[PDB]
Symmetry: D2
């Protein structure tokens, strides 16, 4: 059921800014994000770790908060002015959503902040005020071979992609690419404020769940190094998918799994989307170069597994099942189909994945 | 067992070129020149002679039109003219068929010996070759995917220790191999030129040619070949990869030519030229041995390979492997692999890694 | 003399979009930009070549226009809406600047467009409407080892940097980085709309002149390849400066010279500036890591040479002399000084450039 | 000329390590370990032993505390234990001073011969060495600037042809050199291991050690060294580069340690292992021979180099080059260079390139 456009003006959103993830063992999670991935510690204590990327000047891009149930607690967007936090509150109230306003922040290093249970069941935060820290962008004495330089985007699993898409468009996100079929189904969409392919993205599936948080690197070899290091640490089982070239976004990518199975994407070298008539690219769901441009098969966990999300009380949001067709099922499932060249039987796949693989039992 | 000759082994420098029989010369040319960017040393209606960016000998690859795609010769350069005579005496003592041509079998090679070796493979040994313009600083020509050297061959043969011993007598030194705990050898890598490999043995029905490998300068050059193949909408000819190898530590990719000949693109293995270079043995169930990142080995990699010819140009008969199959013991329905030895977490039973089973 | 802030609202400027460069030999220029640099032809004829980068979808990033005097004819910024072109027109009219509007464009592939002689003497164009073309961002069948992927920025030589900076700020550009000394002089400033370090930048010097136009690559090796190719073509003398790591911007860079001596920068991997309180970085002019972070010396030509610019009638703009201190003189001239570590005599340079020259 | 011994030459595999005397061990450690990321094989209060990422022999660099910074030994590994005996006979026949230590001069080397060679350089030959963990897949340790192998040495010596013929007799093959039309040789590069160089000769006053070179995997690893040096505010210790070489075709950088020992970082030269590997001669006036992009060579690169020690640890006396100077004929007041031979456009007279 369609989400109405409020009369109240949308807040002016700059970018994705940070996620707060609940984690079950804080020391194990620190080992992953600090020792394996090289994120920089802005603050920590016995309950939380606050981490930032190489080029960041706001207080953090990631808060790890200890709790009993691993989940997304908030995805936070920075807004352009303090007054945009008021606009966000009015906007979401008009939408009939539950909201919570804290003048001195939910997490350290953030000031006046609004959290909301959005119409798709996701916990969004909007804030302007944040504690500036040392921007480490020229600290090459600290630079790692796998350095994560920026927070890039979030990706959300939600059952009805068009419903979500219209709501985000009204909030001022522009869709850059999407995946559809010839029968009216949308499987995924990507949308931005900051002028890259994405600040958030919708993946069709049971939800609300958080698919991933993405960080970028400077160069492709930096992503290769993360893989290499995970091999040396004998944690290659935590590399879920990749590395690859995306069709959607044209980025070089890797997906890995934190100790609570929160999925992290490492990403580089997408393209500029800031013009308001930026061409929207629609890929057909059966095109086997859409997700991995080289045609490598998409691991089934990538479609089925995602993180729980919390409501404003800290309880897990109940999952609503997708009734639209499943991307997994129509591409690599038993009645699935994919092609390399449209209309060519050669290099097509019927009821199995590419490259000689089938879905595991 | 293959006996060690009394005659001295030829001093082999390196792998030098392969002659591949191809069925459609123009389609093969499109692949090797237009897609992969190899440099033409000579061509006519019957053959295309190709070299890599840094080569100075006449060629690294000869594509010969013929009725049945196959490997016709894998050629090693020897240190001196006299080493061709040494190769001839050596293989005659082994009781192999040999053929000697004072003026070469292909253009740009002089005095050369071809043999049907004890494993059924057509080896060539030569010294003399026509030098060409070494293109190593021709950055006006350099591709985003530039292939810079010929690196190695890889041969499929049923009995790896038997082949390994024979190659050792020939002066190749084993760098890495893959074994299990009950004494089966699945693969071995061996060199002359001070890299991980000049040729390599993969256990399987043979003789078949598994692949020919070319290097690039950097990892991104390999990524570009993938990217270009997607743009050309030939991603279905990317067989496996890209990845980081366990064995060799090289960054890699496997692609298939129009006759299904497999080409590896490879970079950044390590120096093995010291005589006590430490050998590395990997367990066959170690899921990081082939792809260090644990990505699954596609089953065609284990099953498919090119035919090889005898000196008459007929296809060599295949002999079946009786030792255990790497595919079966790792990714088949009774297969298993681990991430950490002894740890059930990150182990895979009856399927491949990353959530796939065999198609 | 301070440029006043209009009552009229500023246009919403998205980004630098294209430059129109007058060149004297269209074929020689084509050889440089297409054959050497690999830019993509959107359109050409006997008078003009329209070129774009690998990831662009608007008609072009660079127009080469044959003419008698090599010069910048227009530096063009795209605005957010058609109504922003009206805003630009009112804004510059209130500034008392000469303006010209053409509903059907000045160059092919651009629709309704306003050109102005701006208060610093530069020919700015603002436009929204443009013909979309095939975006080549996944055409890896065409991708060059030196591929130029985006237009990034322009850099302008102007005698009074503070005066220009205030005007650009009023127009909506935000200063990301600058170079000053301890005596109240500003030598350079960088400023943006699109959320990178720069869409345009001001270099203190006699002006108006165009210092350079900059294009991006994906990776540092792509810039190295441009140098390697120029060596192979035996045109290494057209490499002016670099490659290097910038202090200001933190980008990896290269400066080369086209056949009419128009300077092109190749640039990669600066940082995100889109937050409105993005911290502004000020360097001291004597800091020998401010321009090349590795302390490589800046050749004098980089400071003294720059392209002519045209007025709306196509005539060369008269050059006004800088009276503020010269960055060349104070760092590498006879009485110049630079340091590696502030306050350390070791690694400092008196009356000469770094690294032995 | 240095006569060829009748005794057989030792079979030399490769350059293996250098022993550098340093004046302040902790400062040197900071440079080679904390800045450059070399891996500790052993240390104590007098010495630090260091290796590159892909090495399995005990070390590639030994830093020894001493009163005067100098090269103490440049060591080549030989193929067999018997090659040490061959090296001893060979240098004895040459009339050179030698010292054999059956248990080595430095830790992790066994039976070793040091010699004061005919050019005044302290060479070591050894086979026996303690194997260590080869770190080539320890990506948990890998630095953004990782030094992966020892590549070569470069020696300053007054008479390049004399040194070249000596090295050829020892089995080194020349790959590239720089000459002029009058017949002067200014520099030569020569190898055993099938790369462009294991050692190289630069014309100048000598014996002095010009540099020791380490390789990286990729060009960005070299860029990272420069960026790191910037961040550490020691950019003044970047001497020359980064660049593409003409000779060798390698991507390069030169930096200076705390005692002004020069280290090259190098990647992506070409294969030279075939015995008829084509030799490349550049003209000294060709401005792309050293830096392919035509960037000027700073005078310090031609004039400055490290002292070397004799076997008593005293500094070797230096012999002045009497052949023409490459500095003088290219960038000095009467020098010149060209971009394109015969073209005055892109030529530099009495001046280096690019405006200096
Ligand atoms: O299959 C793997 O990944 C192991 C391996 C290593 C080096 C090679 O050259 C090769 O062809 C295969
Ligand atoms: O000076 C130059 O640039 C030539 C050169 C090539 C290879 C080397 O290893 C070296 O030290 C110097
Ligand atoms: Ca359908
Ligand atoms: Cl995807
Ligand atoms: Cl600069
Ligand atoms: Fe993503
Ligand atoms: Fe291989
Ligand atoms: Fe610039
Ligand atoms: Fe060197």
């Amino acid at each position: 059921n369609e989400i109405p456009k409020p009369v109240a003006p949308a807040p002016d959103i700059l970018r994705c800014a940070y996620a707060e993830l609940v984690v079950t063992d804080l020391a194990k999670s620190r080992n992953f994000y600090v020792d394996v991935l090289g994120l920089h510690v802005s603050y920590e204590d016995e309950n939380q770790i606050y981490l930032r990327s190489f080029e960041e000047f706001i207080h953090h891009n990631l808060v790890l908060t200890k709790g009993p149930v691993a989940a997304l607690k908030a995805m936070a967007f920075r807004v352009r002015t303090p007054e945009d936090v008021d606009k966000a509150e009015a906007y979401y109230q008009e939408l009939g959503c539950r909201t919570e306003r804290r003048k001195d922040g939910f997490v350290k290093g953030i000031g006046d902040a609004l959290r909301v249970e959005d119409p798709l069941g996701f916990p969004y935060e909007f804030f302007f005020e944040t504690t500036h820290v040392e921007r480490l962008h020229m600290r090459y004495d600290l630079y790692s071979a796998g350095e994560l330089v920026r927070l890039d985007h979030f990706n959300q699993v939600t059952p009805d992609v068009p419903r979500g898409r219209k709501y985000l468009e009204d909030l001022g996100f522009r869709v850059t690419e999407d995946i559809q079929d010839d029968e009216g189904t949308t499987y995924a969409a990507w949308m931005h404020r900051k002028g890259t392919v994405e600040d958030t993205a919708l993946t069709g599936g049971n939800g609300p769940r958080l698919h991933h948080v993405a960080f970028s690197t400077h160069e492709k070899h930096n992503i290769i190094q993360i893989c290499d290091k995970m091999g040396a640490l004998r944690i290659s089982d935590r590399i879920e998918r990749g590395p690859g070239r995306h069709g959607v976004s044209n980025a070089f990518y890797l997906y890995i799994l934190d100790p609570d199975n929160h999925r992290i994407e490492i990403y580089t070298q997408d393209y500029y989307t800031g013009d308001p008539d930026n061409p929207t690219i629609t890929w057909n769901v059966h095109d086997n170069q859409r997700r991995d441009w080289w045609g490598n098969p998409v691991v089934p966990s990538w479609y089925t597994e995602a993180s729980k999300v919390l409501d404003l009380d800290g309880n897990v949001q109940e999952i609503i099942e997708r009734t639209d067709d499943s991307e997994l099922e129509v591409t690599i499932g038993a009645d699935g189909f994919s092609f390399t060249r449209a209309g060519d039987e050669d290099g097509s796949y019927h009821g199995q994945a590419s490259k000689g693989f089938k879905l595991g039992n």
